Structure 1
Amino acid sequence: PHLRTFKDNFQTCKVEGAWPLIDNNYLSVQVTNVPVVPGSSATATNKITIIFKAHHGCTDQKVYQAVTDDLPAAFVDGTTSGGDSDAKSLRIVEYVEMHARYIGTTVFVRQVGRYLTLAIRMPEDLAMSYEESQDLQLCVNGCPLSER
């Protein structure tokens, strides 16, 4: 599909199957892309997985997953907020939106036709906070040259 990176480079990537958009110290964003028709280099998103990693005193680990024709307004455990009932540092509102205030991060997910779209707003210091081995992150470095 089309990708707009944190570095404002716009790319058209095939990236078929499961690919990490974000893989950092605070968040995991994983997508599944499918060829629009068999054998096509044009691909589109049928699954969006977001892992909000455990943040002591703010949220327990939460997982969001949307697929084509299934965009819930809750995490996989049926919760709509992280941690306790009083803890609103992490919440979901119906676009379905995820507000991770604790990491100044917003994630918007919607279904446009048969496929899914994604928009992520993240603070620069947190977006660039990742370990050496976390070098595959479509949002940071874009796609491998062979995928474009």
Structure 2
Amino acid sequence: PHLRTFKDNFQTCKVEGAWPLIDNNYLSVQVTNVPVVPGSSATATNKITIIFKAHHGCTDQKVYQAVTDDLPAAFVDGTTSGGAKSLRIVEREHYVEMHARYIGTTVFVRQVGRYLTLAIRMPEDLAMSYEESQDLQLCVNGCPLSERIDDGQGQVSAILG
């Protein structure tokens, strides 16, 4: 799919299968991407997983999972909040919002056609709060170069007109 990173870059990745969008001390955002057509390197999201890592005093661990045709307004355990008002799910419709007040984080999930669309708003200090090992996070440093869609000649002719 198309990616807009926390660092403001825009890119188009193949990234077939499971890939971490966010992998930090607070949150995990994992996506599954499928080729839009068998031939193509154009892929789209059919699964979103979000792990709201346990935060002592605020929430217990909560897992949200959306898949094409199934966008619930609750966590995997049929729960709608944290173990008080620190973490909450809101349905708006086909269109869901997670409000992680305890971490200033908001996750927006929408089904657009046969595929999923995701957007995360997160504070800079928390989004950059991960260990050196957690270096694959598409929201932070994009997808690896090998996964990026390069036209070059075509994009260059497009910009040149």
Deviation string for 1:17-48 (max 9, x for gaps)?
00000000000000000000112100000000
CA distance in 1: counterparts of 2:21 and 2:75, whole angstroms: 19
TM-score (norm 2): 0.89
TM-score (norm 1): 0.97
CA distance in 2: counterparts of 1:92 and 1:81, whole angstroms: 6
Question: What is the Cα-based RMSD across aligned positions, in Å?
Answer: 0.8
More helix as a share of residues = 2
Q: CA deviation at 1:95?
A: 1.7
Q: Which residues of structure 1 form unaligned runs of 5+?
A: none
Q: Alignment length, in residue pairs? A: 145
Deviation string for 1:46-101 (max 9, x for gaps)?
00000000000000000000000000000000000010xxx010000092000000
**Equivalent residue, structure 1, for 2:43:** 43
CA distance in 1: counterparts of 2:39 and 2:126, whole angstroms: 38
- Work out which of the residue numbers 86, 91, 99 in structure 1 matches 2:88: 91
CA distance in 1: counterparts of 2:58 and 2:87, whole angstroms: 8
Percent pairwise identity: 99
Q: Which residues of structure 2 form unaligned runs of 5+?
A: 149-161
> Which segment drifts farther, 120-129 or 88-97?
88-97
| Runs of 4 or more consecutive aligned structure 1 residues displaced over 4 Å after TM superposition | none
> Which segment drifts farther, 94-103 or 37-46?
94-103
